[PDB]
Amino acid sequence: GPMEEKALIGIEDFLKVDLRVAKVLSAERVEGSEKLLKLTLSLGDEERTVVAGIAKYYTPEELVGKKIVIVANLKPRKIFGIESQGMILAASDGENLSVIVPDRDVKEGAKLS
């Protein structure tokens, strides 16, 4: 369940996920939508387009040029006529929303798993 408490998992279930560091090359508004943002991200040797519902929480000024953590091995989908592959990590406390960045300026493409 999306709102349920998550039972204990082994390291395998974590290793199934491909967490990576990606540099936001650009973040533009999605036409016909006030909540979506189309973000191009560099993973070092490959680029990725991700549609994220964070337009009300993040302006593109506070995103472009930053290194953020993403899930790279999500199956591709069609969001508002845009081919989006993967998704961004985002933490909420019920009040604010925040993207997820590395503590030190690690290079783009750095893996977490």
Next chain:
Amino acid sequence: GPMEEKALIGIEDFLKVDLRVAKVLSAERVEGSEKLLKLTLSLGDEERTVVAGIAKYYTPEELVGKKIVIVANLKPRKIFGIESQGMILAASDGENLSVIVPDRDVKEGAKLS
């Protein structure tokens, strides 16, 4: 395998892992080990003890008081006599290691999944 290319996954496999923001309360060294630090982490309403092999890259001083992303629902294990339950997110690029923090200040225990 850890060095293998990870196949594409559905979002359920991601939702199965419990990624949370936790505040580092303390960070001490582990007796008999030169690589491991024992960190206590506040999740707002509950605490966690995690042993991490990052002493080569992080001193206690550059960790305590920070908000870092962790996997909170990992099965517990006895590491060097310490009961550790949970794992800290860490990004590496073959040259530098970095813990993972929220871009914006979010309340401890903030849910990412």
